[PDB]
């Protein structure tokens, strides 16, 4: 499995589950609205905290605008259209010491599957 470090400290590590368009490297760019599916779980307890797959509602955000946690901007920036990946995001690139509400404690390593479906620009 194609497995790579997206930050030099190993804080964001991506394993490719299914290769996308690697032949033509069809990759989104900063500012593009991206459409993905995802599932997120805590590495510590294994608890799944969210799944757009189970909702069956694809998730949209603008890439590299700080709309999402840094490890996501870094991860999705590296994905080819139709790629499915597993990404491990250390707390510094996630929610840090604060965590996120009742579902994500402080100092949490996060594991997400992300599937890049589509992207667009105005
Ligand atoms: C119901 O489900 C939520 C998503 C939930 C929230 C809580 C968590 C556990 C989680 O379960 O997703 C989760 O799985 C998670 O950790 N995610 C979601 C998928 C992307 C990665 C991560 C994340 O960054 O969430 C994000 C995290 C929770 C908060 C941000 C982290 C980065 C930091 O820089 C931001 O500060 C600004 C805050 C939430 C989001 O991905 C969304 C889309 C973005 C916003 C809320 C903020 O960026 C915001 O600015 C204020 C905006 O500018 C936006 C686009 C305005 C529009 C109208 C709002 C859309 C809201 C959609 C929210 C929905 C689908």
PDB file of C-alpha atoms and ligand atoms in Angstrom:
ATOM      1  CA  UNK A   1       0.000   0.000   0.000  1.00  0.00           C
ATOM      2  CA  UNK A   2       1.291   3.387  -1.161  1.00  0.00           C
ATOM      3  CA  UNK A   3       2.150   4.944   2.253  1.00  0.00           C
ATOM      4  CA  UNK A   4       3.694   8.435   2.728  1.00  0.00           C
ATOM      5  CA  UNK A   5       4.554  11.177   5.242  1.00  0.00           C
ATOM      6  CA  UNK A   6       2.927  14.487   4.382  1.00  0.00           C
ATOM      7  CA  UNK A   7       4.674  16.409   7.171  1.00  0.00           C
ATOM      8  CA  UNK A   8       8.343  16.021   8.048  1.00  0.00           C
ATOM      9  CA  UNK A   9       7.612  15.106  11.702  1.00  0.00           C
ATOM     10  CA  UNK A  10       5.310  12.195  10.793  1.00  0.00           C
ATOM     11  CA  UNK A  11       2.342  14.145  12.186  1.00  0.00           C
ATOM     12  CA  UNK A  12       0.335  13.473   9.043  1.00  0.00           C
ATOM     13  CA  UNK A  13       0.737  10.044   7.460  1.00  0.00           C
ATOM     14  CA  UNK A  14      -1.378   8.823   4.532  1.00  0.00           C
ATOM     15  CA  UNK A  15      -1.933   5.235   3.344  1.00  0.00           C
ATOM     16  CA  UNK A  16      -3.583   4.882  -0.070  1.00  0.00           C
ATOM     17  CA  UNK A  17      -6.389   2.306   0.074  1.00  0.00           C
ATOM     18  CA  UNK A  18      -7.472   2.830  -3.549  1.00  0.00           C
ATOM     19  CA  UNK A  19      -5.423   4.772  -6.107  1.00  0.00           C
ATOM     20  CA  UNK A  20      -7.162   7.584  -7.961  1.00  0.00           C
ATOM     21  CA  UNK A  21      -6.139   9.347 -11.154  1.00  0.00           C
ATOM     22  CA  UNK A  22      -2.360   8.992 -10.767  1.00  0.00           C
ATOM     23  CA  UNK A  23      -1.786   8.825 -14.528  1.00  0.00           C
ATOM     24  CA  UNK A  24      -2.712  12.481 -14.937  1.00  0.00           C
ATOM     25  CA  UNK A  25      -2.328  13.555 -11.298  1.00  0.00           C
ATOM     26  CA  UNK A  26      -5.816  15.140 -11.172  1.00  0.00           C
ATOM     27  CA  UNK A  27      -5.324  16.968  -7.895  1.00  0.00           C
ATOM     28  CA  UNK A  28      -7.419  19.796  -6.360  1.00  0.00           C
ATOM     29  CA  UNK A  29      -5.906  23.227  -5.709  1.00  0.00           C
ATOM     30  CA  UNK A  30      -6.168  25.803  -2.946  1.00  0.00           C
ATOM     31  CA  UNK A  31      -9.554  27.524  -2.910  1.00  0.00           C
ATOM     32  CA  UNK A  32     -11.310  24.743  -4.814  1.00  0.00           C
ATOM     33  CA  UNK A  33     -14.429  23.394  -3.223  1.00  0.00           C
ATOM     34  CA  UNK A  34     -13.826  19.698  -2.716  1.00  0.00           C
ATOM     35  CA  UNK A  35     -16.467  16.978  -2.213  1.00  0.00           C
ATOM     36  CA  UNK A  36     -15.488  13.952  -0.142  1.00  0.00           C
ATOM     37  CA  UNK A  37     -16.791  11.127   1.952  1.00  0.00           C
ATOM     38  CA  UNK A  38     -15.098  10.413   5.265  1.00  0.00           C
ATOM     39  CA  UNK A  39     -15.145   8.405   8.470  1.00  0.00           C
ATOM     40  CA  UNK A  40     -13.256   9.565  11.541  1.00  0.00           C
ATOM     41  CA  UNK A  41     -12.183   7.594  14.588  1.00  0.00           C
ATOM     42  CA  UNK A  42      -9.998   8.046  17.655  1.00  0.00           C
ATOM     43  CA  UNK A  43      -6.763   6.055  17.559  1.00  0.00           C
ATOM     44  CA  UNK A  44      -6.759   5.753  21.385  1.00  0.00           C
ATOM     45  CA  UNK A  45     -10.150   4.133  22.013  1.00  0.00           C
ATOM     46  CA  UNK A  46     -11.052   3.227  18.428  1.00  0.00           C
ATOM     47  CA  UNK A  47     -14.313   5.170  18.756  1.00  0.00           C
ATOM     48  CA  UNK A  48     -15.858   6.253  15.447  1.00  0.00           C
ATOM     49  CA  UNK A  49     -17.014   9.822  16.035  1.00  0.00           C
ATOM     50  CA  UNK A  50     -18.437  10.599  12.585  1.00  0.00           C
ATOM     51  CA  UNK A  51     -19.125   9.049   9.187  1.00  0.00           C
ATOM     52  CA  UNK A  52     -20.476  10.851   6.116  1.00  0.00           C
ATOM     53  CA  UNK A  53     -20.663   7.378   4.491  1.00  0.00           C
ATOM     54  CA  UNK A  54     -23.262   6.284   7.121  1.00  0.00           C
ATOM     55  CA  UNK A  55     -25.097   9.650   6.763  1.00  0.00           C
ATOM     56  CA  UNK A  56     -24.858   9.112   2.990  1.00  0.00           C
ATOM     57  CA  UNK A  57     -24.250  12.860   2.660  1.00  0.00           C
ATOM     58  CA  UNK A  58     -21.009  13.900   0.944  1.00  0.00           C
ATOM     59  CA  UNK A  59     -18.990  16.622   2.692  1.00  0.00           C
ATOM     60  CA  UNK A  60     -17.875  19.863   0.988  1.00  0.00           C
ATOM     61  CA  UNK A  61     -15.199  22.363   2.010  1.00  0.00           C
ATOM     62  CA  UNK A  62     -12.759  24.793   0.411  1.00  0.00           C
ATOM     63  CA  UNK A  63      -9.241  23.395   0.254  1.00  0.00           C
ATOM     64  CA  UNK A  64      -6.408  25.134   2.080  1.00  0.00           C
ATOM     65  CA  UNK A  65      -8.530  27.968   3.515  1.00  0.00           C
ATOM     66  CA  UNK A  66      -8.392  26.803   7.171  1.00  0.00           C
ATOM     67  CA  UNK A  67     -12.032  25.662   7.086  1.00  0.00           C
ATOM     68  CA  UNK A  68     -10.906  22.278   8.372  1.00  0.00           C
ATOM     69  CA  UNK A  69      -8.185  20.939  10.656  1.00  0.00           C
ATOM     70  CA  UNK A  70      -4.682  21.358   9.217  1.00  0.00           C
ATOM     71  CA  UNK A  71      -4.077  17.640   8.709  1.00  0.00           C
ATOM     72  CA  UNK A  72      -7.104  17.540   6.389  1.00  0.00           C
ATOM     73  CA  UNK A  73      -5.900  20.487   4.278  1.00  0.00           C
ATOM     74  CA  UNK A  74      -2.521  18.753   4.026  1.00  0.00           C
ATOM     75  CA  UNK A  75      -4.060  15.373   3.268  1.00  0.00           C
ATOM     76  CA  UNK A  76      -6.598  16.418   0.676  1.00  0.00           C
ATOM     77  CA  UNK A  77      -3.991  18.609  -1.113  1.00  0.00           C
ATOM     78  CA  UNK A  78      -2.094  15.396  -1.838  1.00  0.00           C
ATOM     79  CA  UNK A  79      -5.043  13.321  -3.091  1.00  0.00           C
ATOM     80  CA  UNK A  80      -5.871  12.479  -6.694  1.00  0.00           C
ATOM     81  CA  UNK A  81      -9.491  12.470  -7.853  1.00  0.00           C
ATOM     82  CA  UNK A  82     -11.150   9.164  -6.781  1.00  0.00           C
ATOM     83  CA  UNK A  83      -8.404   8.283  -4.295  1.00  0.00           C
ATOM     84  CA  UNK A  84      -9.441   6.586  -1.061  1.00  0.00           C
ATOM     85  CA  UNK A  85      -6.946   6.997   1.765  1.00  0.00           C
ATOM     86  CA  UNK A  86      -6.431   6.359   5.428  1.00  0.00           C
ATOM     87  CA  UNK A  87      -4.793   9.354   7.137  1.00  0.00           C
ATOM     88  CA  UNK A  88      -3.334   9.472  10.656  1.00  0.00           C
ATOM     89  CA  UNK A  89      -3.360  13.010  12.098  1.00  0.00           C
ATOM     90  CA  UNK A  90      -1.478  13.741  15.322  1.00  0.00           C
ATOM     91  CA  UNK A  91      -3.046  16.189  17.739  1.00  0.00           C
ATOM     92  CA  UNK A  92      -0.897  19.158  16.575  1.00  0.00           C
ATOM     93  CA  UNK A  93      -2.582  18.862  13.120  1.00  0.00           C
ATOM     94  CA  UNK A  94      -6.012  18.093  14.589  1.00  0.00           C
ATOM     95  CA  UNK A  95      -7.672  19.688  17.615  1.00  0.00           C
ATOM     96  CA  UNK A  96      -4.601  19.990  19.812  1.00  0.00           C
ATOM     97  CA  UNK A  97      -4.914  20.365  23.570  1.00  0.00           C
ATOM     98  CA  UNK A  98      -8.492  21.748  23.380  1.00  0.00           C
ATOM     99  CA  UNK A  99     -10.014  18.783  21.544  1.00  0.00           C
ATOM    100  CA  UNK A 100     -13.467  19.152  19.986  1.00  0.00           C
ATOM    101  CA  UNK A 101     -16.549  19.078  22.196  1.00  0.00           C
ATOM    102  CA  UNK A 102     -17.716  15.858  23.826  1.00  0.00           C
ATOM    103  CA  UNK A 103     -16.468  13.541  21.048  1.00  0.00           C
ATOM    104  CA  UNK A 104     -12.752  14.371  20.754  1.00  0.00           C
ATOM    105  CA  UNK A 105     -10.572  14.753  23.825  1.00  0.00           C
ATOM    106  CA  UNK A 106      -7.411  16.824  24.033  1.00  0.00           C
ATOM    107  CA  UNK A 107      -4.211  15.283  22.672  1.00  0.00           C
ATOM    108  CA  UNK A 108      -6.088  12.956  20.318  1.00  0.00           C
ATOM    109  CA  UNK A 109      -4.566  11.209  17.317  1.00  0.00           C
ATOM    110  CA  UNK A 110      -7.272  10.954  14.674  1.00  0.00           C
ATOM    111  CA  UNK A 111      -7.698   8.362  11.963  1.00  0.00           C
ATOM    112  CA  UNK A 112      -9.827   9.261   8.936  1.00  0.00           C
ATOM    113  CA  UNK A 113     -10.735   7.483   5.745  1.00  0.00           C
ATOM    114  CA  UNK A 114     -11.241  10.086   3.032  1.00  0.00           C
ATOM    115  CA  UNK A 115     -12.588   9.490  -0.494  1.00  0.00           C
ATOM    116  CA  UNK A 116     -12.119  12.374  -2.943  1.00  0.00           C
ATOM    117  CA  UNK A 117     -15.171  12.417  -5.214  1.00  0.00           C
ATOM    118  CA  UNK A 118     -15.068  15.743  -7.057  1.00  0.00           C
ATOM    119  CA  UNK A 119     -13.765  19.316  -6.948  1.00  0.00           C
ATOM    120  CA  UNK A 120     -14.746  22.618  -8.521  1.00  0.00           C
ATOM    121  CA  UNK A 121     -13.959  26.303  -8.757  1.00  0.00           C
ATOM    122  CA  UNK A 122     -16.156  29.390  -9.346  1.00  0.00           C
TER     123      UNK A 122
HETATM  124  C1  LIG B   1     -22.542  18.401  11.497  1.00  0.00           C
HETATM  125  O1  LIG B   1     -21.250  17.955  11.086  1.00  0.00           O
HETATM  126  C2  LIG B   1     -20.328  18.999  10.924  1.00  0.00           C
HETATM  127  C3  LIG B   1     -18.902  18.446  10.861  1.00  0.00           C
HETATM  128  C4  LIG B   1     -18.507  17.745  12.150  1.00  0.00           C
HETATM  129  C5  LIG B   1     -18.148  18.693  13.254  1.00  0.00           C
HETATM  130  C6  LIG B   1     -17.507  18.029  14.420  1.00  0.00           C
HETATM  131  C7  LIG B   1     -16.521  17.006  14.070  1.00  0.00           C
HETATM  132  C8  LIG B   1     -15.682  16.278  15.151  1.00  0.00           C
HETATM  133  C9  LIG B   1     -16.650  16.284  12.804  1.00  0.00           C
HETATM  134  O2  LIG B   1     -17.510  15.207  13.266  1.00  0.00           O
HETATM  135  O3  LIG B   1     -17.373  16.923  11.780  1.00  0.00           O
HETATM  136  C10 LIG B   1     -15.485  15.706  12.277  1.00  0.00           C
HETATM  137  O4  LIG B   1     -15.579  14.650  11.894  1.00  0.00           O
HETATM  138  C11 LIG B   1     -14.244  16.422  11.952  1.00  0.00           C
HETATM  139  O5  LIG B   1     -13.356  16.409  12.744  1.00  0.00           O
HETATM  140  N1  LIG B   1     -14.115  17.127  10.738  1.00  0.00           N
HETATM  141  C12 LIG B   1     -15.157  17.220   9.695  1.00  0.00           C
HETATM  142  C13 LIG B   1     -14.569  16.882   8.347  1.00  0.00           C
HETATM  143  C14 LIG B   1     -13.389  17.709   8.077  1.00  0.00           C
HETATM  144  C15 LIG B   1     -12.337  17.516   9.144  1.00  0.00           C
HETATM  145  C16 LIG B   1     -12.853  17.830  10.526  1.00  0.00           C
HETATM  146  C17 LIG B   1     -13.005  19.303  10.669  1.00  0.00           C
HETATM  147  O6  LIG B   1     -12.105  20.075  10.440  1.00  0.00           O
HETATM  148  O7  LIG B   1     -14.220  19.791  11.103  1.00  0.00           O
HETATM  149  C18 LIG B   1     -14.339  21.202  11.289  1.00  0.00           C
HETATM  150  C19 LIG B   1     -14.080  21.580  12.768  1.00  0.00           C
HETATM  151  C20 LIG B   1     -15.137  20.969  13.682  1.00  0.00           C
HETATM  152  C21 LIG B   1     -14.001  23.100  13.048  1.00  0.00           C
HETATM  153  C22 LIG B   1     -12.919  23.899  12.275  1.00  0.00           C
HETATM  154  C23 LIG B   1     -11.537  23.311  12.414  1.00  0.00           C
HETATM  155  C24 LIG B   1     -10.506  24.190  11.686  1.00  0.00           C
HETATM  156  C25 LIG B   1     -10.501  25.603  12.232  1.00  0.00           C
HETATM  157  O8  LIG B   1      -9.612  26.429  11.486  1.00  0.00           O
HETATM  158  C26 LIG B   1     -11.873  26.152  12.071  1.00  0.00           C
HETATM  159  O9  LIG B   1     -11.821  27.438  12.660  1.00  0.00           O
HETATM  160  C27 LIG B   1     -12.428  28.407  11.858  1.00  0.00           C
HETATM  161  C28 LIG B   1     -12.925  25.321  12.793  1.00  0.00           C
HETATM  162  C29 LIG B   1     -15.737  21.631  10.812  1.00  0.00           C
HETATM  163  C30 LIG B   1     -15.826  21.746   9.319  1.00  0.00           C
HETATM  164  O10 LIG B   1     -15.210  21.012   8.610  1.00  0.00           O
HETATM  165  C31 LIG B   1     -16.606  22.774   8.686  1.00  0.00           C
HETATM  166  C32 LIG B   1     -17.241  22.530   7.378  1.00  0.00           C
HETATM  167  C33 LIG B   1     -16.151  24.190   8.878  1.00  0.00           C
HETATM  168  C34 LIG B   1     -16.667  25.218   9.789  1.00  0.00           C
HETATM  169  C35 LIG B   1     -17.460  24.856  10.996  1.00  0.00           C
HETATM  170  C36 LIG B   1     -15.712  26.373   9.911  1.00  0.00           C
HETATM  171  O11 LIG B   1     -14.596  26.345   9.053  1.00  0.00           O
HETATM  172  C37 LIG B   1     -16.354  27.614   9.458  1.00  0.00           C
HETATM  173  O12 LIG B   1     -15.859  28.752  10.013  1.00  0.00           O
HETATM  174  C38 LIG B   1     -16.160  29.110  11.360  1.00  0.00           C
HETATM  175  C39 LIG B   1     -16.699  27.768   8.036  1.00  0.00           C
HETATM  176  O13 LIG B   1     -16.114  28.649   7.453  1.00  0.00           O
HETATM  177  C40 LIG B   1     -17.645  27.011   7.206  1.00  0.00           C
HETATM  178  C41 LIG B   1     -17.147  26.339   5.989  1.00  0.00           C
HETATM  179  C42 LIG B   1     -19.051  27.583   7.178  1.00  0.00           C
HETATM  180  C43 LIG B   1     -20.197  26.632   6.816  1.00  0.00           C
HETATM  181  C44 LIG B   1     -21.453  27.467   6.593  1.00  0.00           C
HETATM  182  C45 LIG B   1     -20.354  25.644   7.913  1.00  0.00           C
HETATM  183  C46 LIG B   1     -20.487  24.320   7.604  1.00  0.00           C
HETATM  184  C47 LIG B   1     -20.550  23.335   8.725  1.00  0.00           C
HETATM  185  C48 LIG B   1     -20.583  21.996   8.517  1.00  0.00           C
HETATM  186  C49 LIG B   1     -20.324  21.193   9.741  1.00  0.00           C
HETATM  187  C50 LIG B   1     -20.751  19.777   9.713  1.00  0.00           C
HETATM  188  C51 LIG B   1     -20.690  19.084   8.407  1.00  0.00           C
END
